[PDB]
């Protein structure tokens, strides 16, 4: 018997909208402490880590741990049938989803087929980062979208007072320079050792689909190590994305 009630159900819709394009199929680890999802993409170039603490729900009971294999695209298709201000109950070889309207006079019940597939135990090495950049999730989405009209890869140069995003392609080349601000709309650079790394805009554009989940985003870098992009879900957990560099 597993049962979790989420009042501001829009969180789940946003979470799956953030996963479907990157991970076609994934395995949800349910436990007493909450929900957790880890998966590499097909090409082993990125990794997404989802955390939803049990405390963030309004009902939670998981007497013993589960491992659900879910086609994320299938699950996304179903969650678009939920309204944006609706209350969502997950209940659990079938995964039920229950949609309560505001007035509790329209109620919906969907039973999703699961997949028999193996849970991954991915080893993430311990790391902390020369540069950590905190900035509005909107500005960072726009930076990636703009430079993707110029090139397929972005060069990120972190110095102490500013960060530079560069791309180049057929029609020219572009640069975006962000300075430290001085609210909720701040841009924060915290640097120990300057870093410049190159990443594929395609995967960053997968990542920024998590933008509806948070007003800010955190970028973490060091020489020759994967980028981490982290969005904080309200106070329930986070969605971390790792992206290996190019060279």
């Amino acid at each position: 018997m597993f049962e979790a009630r989420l009042v501001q159900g829009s969180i789940l819709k946003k979470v799956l909208e953030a996963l479907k394009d990157l991970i076609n199929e994934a395995c949800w680890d349910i436990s007493s402490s909450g929900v957790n999802l880890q998966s590499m993409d097909s090409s082993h170039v990125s990794l997404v880590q989802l955390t939803l603490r049990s405390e963030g729900f309004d009902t939670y009971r998981c007497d013993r741990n589960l491992a659900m294999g879910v086609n994320l695209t299938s699950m996304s298709k179903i969650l678009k049938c939920a309204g944006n201000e609706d209350i969502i109950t997950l209940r659990a070889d079938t995964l039920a989803l229950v949609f309560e309207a505001p007035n509790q006079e329209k109620v919906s019940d969907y039973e999703m087929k699961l997949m028999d597939l193996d849970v991954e135990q991915l080893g993430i090495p311990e790391q902390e980062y020369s540069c950590v950049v905190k900035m509005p999730s909107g500005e960072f989405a726009r930076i990636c979208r703009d430079l993707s009209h110029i090139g397929d890869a972005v060069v990120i140069s972190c110095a102490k007072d500013g960060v530079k995003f560069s791309a180049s392609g057929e029609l020219g080349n572009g640069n975006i320079k962000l300075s430290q601000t001085s609210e909720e709309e701040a841009v924060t650079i915290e640097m120990n050792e300057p870093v410049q790394l190159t990443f594929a805009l395609r995967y960053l554009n997968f990542f920024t689909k998590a933008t509806p989940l948070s007003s800010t985003v955190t970028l973490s870098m060091s020489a020759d190590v994967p980028l981490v992009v982290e969005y904080k879900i309200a106070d329930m957990g986070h969605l971390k994305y790792y992206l290996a560099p190019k060279i």
């Binding site: 590499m40 990125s46 991915l122 090495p125 994967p226 290996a244 560099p245 190019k246």
Partner: peptide, 11 residues
């Protein structure tokens, strides 16, 4: 051109 995470210490 592109590295994988498995070439960056992951498993």
């Amino acid at each position: 051109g592109q590295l994988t995470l498995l070439q960056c210490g992951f498993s």
